[PDB]
Enzyme design. Structure first.
Site, PDB file in Angstrom:
ATOM      1  CG  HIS A 132      -5.432   0.888  10.549  1.00  0.00           C
ATOM      2  ND1 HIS A 132      -5.286   1.661  11.725  1.00  0.00           N
ATOM      3  CD2 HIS A 132      -4.697   1.504   9.603  1.00  0.00           C
ATOM      4  CE1 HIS A 132      -4.561   2.743  11.420  1.00  0.00           C
ATOM      5  NE2 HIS A 132      -4.142   2.638  10.145  1.00  0.00           N
ATOM      6  CG  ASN A 179      -3.466   8.489   4.564  1.00  0.00           C
ATOM      7  OD1 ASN A 179      -3.593   7.736   5.579  1.00  0.00           O
ATOM      8  ND2 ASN A 179      -2.918   8.094   3.445  1.00  0.00           N
ATOM      9  CG  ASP A 231      -6.636   0.924  14.836  1.00  0.00           C
ATOM     10  OD1 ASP A 231      -6.824   0.905  16.072  1.00  0.00           O
ATOM     11  OD2 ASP A 231      -5.551   1.262  14.260  1.00  0.00           O
ATOM     12  CD  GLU A 283      -6.488   2.390   3.904  1.00  0.00           C
ATOM     13  OE1 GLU A 283      -6.073   1.444   3.172  1.00  0.00           O
ATOM     14  OE2 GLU A 283      -6.124   2.757   5.070  1.00  0.00           O
ATOM     15  CG  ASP A 333      -4.581   5.271   3.014  1.00  0.00           C
ATOM     16  OD1 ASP A 333      -5.450   6.150   2.986  1.00  0.00           O
ATOM     17  OD2 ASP A 333      -4.221   4.721   4.084  1.00  0.00           O
ATOM     18  CD  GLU A 345      -1.979  -1.034   7.563  1.00  0.00           C
ATOM     19  OE1 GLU A 345      -2.529  -0.799   8.639  1.00  0.00           O
ATOM     20  OE2 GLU A 345      -1.696  -0.045   6.859  1.00  0.00           O
ATOM     21  CE  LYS A 353      -2.655   1.350   3.638  1.00  0.00           C
ATOM     22  NZ  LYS A 353      -3.753   0.880   4.603  1.00  0.00           N
ATOM     23  CD  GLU A 403      -6.615   4.631   8.589  1.00  0.00           C
ATOM     24  OE1 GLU A 403      -6.463   3.925   7.517  1.00  0.00           O
ATOM     25  OE2 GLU A 403      -5.764   5.454   8.942  1.00  0.00           O
ATOM     26  CE  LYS A 441      -0.283   5.819   4.906  1.00  0.00           C
ATOM     27  NZ  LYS A 441      -1.262   4.809   5.355  1.00  0.00           N
TER      28      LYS A 441
HETATM   29 MG   LIG Z   1      -5.257   4.289   5.883  1.00  0.00          MG
END
Ligand SMILES: [Mg+2]
Ligand SMILES: [Mg+2]
Ligand SMILES: [Mg+2]
Ligand SMILES: [Mg+2]
Lengths: 357, 357, 357, 357
Positions: free
Chosen positions: A295, A195, A268, A219, A193, A315, A162, A245, A164
């Site tokens: 997560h 974020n 998470d 994500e 992701d 993850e 993954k 998450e 970001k």
């Molecule tokens: Mg994330």
């Protein structure tokens, strides 16, 4: 009849195996609170919390230290303990740092219950251990470092990574994803992701371009509490939107799945409410037909996923590797649970003093 | 590593403490299949199934006998075992008598897991034992017998009873409820159950008259699979509609709660899928805000309710009292879980041979 | 006035014309219960049930043997008989193996009613016989065997085939479909069936790739009871999602069509509740605008489809060919109903003894 | 150009004017964090936070002390500052104790902006001061003390009081409400608050009995995050359901008003996000047609309500009276804003040292 007899917490700033690159700059340590839960059976439960930013670290340790008197002399029984904490914090608000602290006590209390019965947590939950596919999670790394990290993951046997993304232009996100894809080839997962960095129309434009590239999921494209905005983004995509998450308790997951915010979930283990919260979250993802990943918290998540009917990915992001023994193993990109009672978390006592706050 | 090593089943027709009066006539025995699950640890898990009618009894035992080869040499791990059985029966249809048989294996497998760890099931599930309020469940008894049974329950310390109603005229249902209410007084629960006997308009007319009398809930007013018809009945009532004894798996509970069919639920430990299914059902009732009672299976239900965040009542209806020791106790109308490993089910071996088919 | 006078059942394991390849391995026989329903008119109704797995076969025969006393001395009148059985099993749960057994009695009772009136079932239902298009149904056969079976079907005059897919990678499903398509050409139906094997996001990804290939429908992409998950898959497709072989009664079809789970339906004559259940299912598919095919039971389904206003395809999969005479004919890939009273099922008495359990 | 130059916090346990009676026992002090925000203009902004329980008090002060470096040298500009804090805490979770701390900085930053411009906050927000009707808020006090407190409020000129209810039996709630009503007469408001203590069916039964008594609203009958359960309770009532003291940010208010959870709202100036959050909340209550009251923080709430188009009541509950001068006045039961710059909060410096932690 087994009672909790003490809570000890230690706040640490630990070095990260992969420094985290952000839009601001690089962070090379993670702020954690390590938790020891003493019991009358002589076993000690262990867990830890991630504070995210060092601004929250001392406050989270002080909150846990002042909750010790609510739990000492209670029976270890995590589901009962969780109901007691939910009621005691119903005015303050059983969410955010209070809920995270409660989850750290729950994850320690389940590690001690597995130790009282000399059994790995996965078996205490009624399931067999199984290897679970994992992906290696990187950061906002730019084209060269993201590609080097993807090539190291692939050489370590992971079959997905993954990265970001959310650079100032969509072309730079696509330059990252294409460079990784050239280096790892087509038979390899690239999750991406954002974020929470995009508004809904930007997330639809960028994600339709990323879906043409071929990515595994998209994500948290927008603010994490905006479940309707995630549902509007997912309605414009074939690739699945992944989130979760940042759900604080299964009651937030339920609200997002009831409106169709996402076609994947990834709770998470701390924010969903520990093992007690994850068991509940697993039942919801099963009924709403949502494949469920994890997560952070890889050590407990390998056990939890093996009991989760819709388990999807684990993850890998090793926040506490500097202070916990490497009892969790990755074998051909799958996490393999150790054959140790409870979660398998054993402190590196000679390392912890290096990182204390 | 603890493996299942054998399944033994015995079909019995056991005498009921309270013969069951129906619109047809009286039934004085219950058809049960008693289950023993052998393990490599030397402990034996026990459960039982209710076949409802003797027409299904030999078929349910033969089905379990022919499932033994699917489970022998598997690890005891009930959650894993349940996933395996759900997949093996996905064409036949993992519902009705197949799902009931799977639930009897799950409830035996959890009783053995509690015995392997020398711990009552409630503690294995992470909760403390607590006494749970119970009501005494009667049948379609007519005014004199229903009133005598309510007075005996009240003398035994129960603070609520359930009577089955659905006589040919609404006046006779109201004559039953009023006679009980005269005998037990106002500070006493009277649940009423129409056992699927009414169409929706009759159920609205009769239930609005019963709500004026003052009853605790109105159970299964119409066909059990008609969740929308239960939602139309509940939309016309302040008193809560109760249902759930006929949900086969948590996936049927989810469908009925997603349309608002009922404001109370009462899963049956066998039909909901045993301990594994009830854990899932508990998480759904918590998120949908539905107080959750039990249906039959009092011995395991006292443990399951103590782990259920929305626990409401335990139904006392002692189907297997003739063949199981009275380790479950009622103390001031509350059920109290025994301090015995697993569920606390111990066979009366000298009685079972009297009732074998 | 014509009364039922006896029920006789025989459990058999019969050789399949096409052994069934699965993800586990090959199965070369089908477990069936053959049913004879005696009447006071001297005619005997015939039907059969499919038990799916031999784990259920003895249990289904024992259940039918113990239901004989509920039907003997009742009038043959299948719609009345079905209402009586629905009420008698309303506590046990009129679903799964109980409903299948009731459907086998209904299909036998209609075959006898057609014999009492010396008329094919299709005419008793008020319709004319018509040839109905059929497709040949295969299994999870791998590229070479699936292509050989498709070429044999095309040489037998069928104009469509169904293959089961859900290999570990989507490329292997596409390799199967493309190889068939090369062998049979473009003017030929290829249905595909994932037999509940995918989660929703995998089903959307795989089905959008299969829709680009050109397939006729996509059948049961996910768990059969997850109607909302089928509706989320269908919302991402132009090709139609097909389901329905696992609906136990028309009340399950109604729930799936009310949420838009599928744009095609295919009830199974046994699980939908026999001729009585199929008549009801036909009326629902007509009002919800859903073309309606059959699943298994080709002999009765050729009659039922000719009375079904939205009839679409008949599934050819000859489960009972080893024990029933080949009175149903396929002429240029269409099934043609025999001119025989009732369903046209006549036992091969000298073959049945070879396969008895 | 006016910049923040320092943050100072002091944690105190202050005596309550009315000790708070709960189901557990009496609490006679409130845990507060008093906030001073220094600026380059020489004015100092003041606010305070309520920690609810002393378990959270040191943690909230330590969190604020560690946030000082995020705000010192930023321009005072509260709306900009709030956006910066929302982004900085988007991973940790901008909710619970983090959001409360951000709100205490916002309420201090607006008190300093009003001081920089020598103007009461209400005028800085563009509105004229107006007296706002207030009710006196009591606790779970039992019939005698609740009636004495209602009679003292009525003698002080308030025209409504709130009592907390949720005794073990509904008759005791009704005995409280009836005794107050006898003492204060019919032309007087009695609000009632169940402080999340009921499940949905109990809340419908108890609230329909309280609506027959005549009460002004029914507040938080069930768990505060269960907006759908509040909407099911409100659908059974004519009296309005009131909620909102536990919404953390306007984004939680928006979710509850979008599903129709309540017909009244009452945000808490700290949990809704300070003055910035309350301005946003006011715009939502105006468009959704919801009369908007306050919860705690009377000193700032008298200013905020005067700018709120749907303002309804101010809750009088004087948490910080022991440490702040009584510049807010109640005149014939209405709160009257002082003619002082900013909020009018001026510390009693000689009292604060008595209560420091
Ligand atoms: Mg994330
Ligand atoms: Mg009932
Ligand atoms: Mg199929
Ligand atoms: Mg309140």
């Amino acid at each position: 009849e087994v009672l909790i007899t003490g809570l000890r917490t230690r706040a640490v700033n630990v070095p990260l195996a992969y420094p985290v690159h952000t839009a601001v700059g690089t962070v090379g340590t993670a702020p954690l609170v390590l938790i020891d839960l003493a019991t009358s059976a002589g076993v000690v439960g262990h867990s830890y919390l991630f504070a995210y930013t060092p601004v929250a670290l001392k406050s989270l340790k002080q909150l846990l230290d002042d909750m010790a008197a609510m739990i000492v002399n209670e029976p270890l029984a995590p589901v009962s303990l969780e109901a007691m904490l939910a009621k005691r914090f119903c005015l303050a608000g059983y969410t955010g740092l209070i809920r995270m602290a409660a989850a750290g006590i729950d994850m320690a209390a389940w590690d001690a219950l597995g130790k009282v019965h000399e059994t790995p947590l996965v078996k205490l939950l009624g399931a067999n251990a199984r290897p679970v596919q994992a992906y290696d999670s990187h950061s906002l790394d730019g084209v060269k470092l993201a590609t080097e990290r993807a090539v190291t993951a692939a050489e370590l046997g992971f079959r997905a990574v993954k990265t970001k993304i959310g650079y100032p232009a969509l072309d730079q996100d696509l330059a990252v994803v294409r460079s990784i894809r050239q280096a790892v080839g087509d038979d390899f997962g690239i999750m991406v992701d954002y974020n929470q960095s995009l508004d809904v129309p930007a997330a639809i434009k960028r994600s339709q371009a990323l879906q043409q590239e071929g990515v595994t999921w998209i994500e948290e494209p927008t603010l994490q509490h905006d479940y309707e905005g995630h549902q509007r983004i997912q309605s414009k995509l074939n690739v699945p939107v992944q989130m979760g998450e940042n759900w604080l308790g299964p009651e937030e997951m339920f609200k997002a799945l009831s409106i169709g915010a996402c076609r994947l979930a990834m709770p998470d283990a701390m924010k969903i409410g520990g093992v007690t919260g994850w068991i509940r979250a697993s039942a919801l993802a099963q009924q709403f037909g949502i494949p469920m990943s994890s997560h952070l918290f890889q050590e407990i998540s390998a056990h939890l996923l093996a009991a989760t009917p819709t388990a999807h990915w684990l993850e890998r992001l090793d926040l506490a590797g500097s202070v916990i023994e490497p009892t969790l193993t990755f074998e051909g990109g799958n996490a393999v649970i150790p054959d140790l009672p409870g979660v398998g978390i054993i402190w590196r006592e000679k390392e912890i003093g290096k990182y204390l706050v």
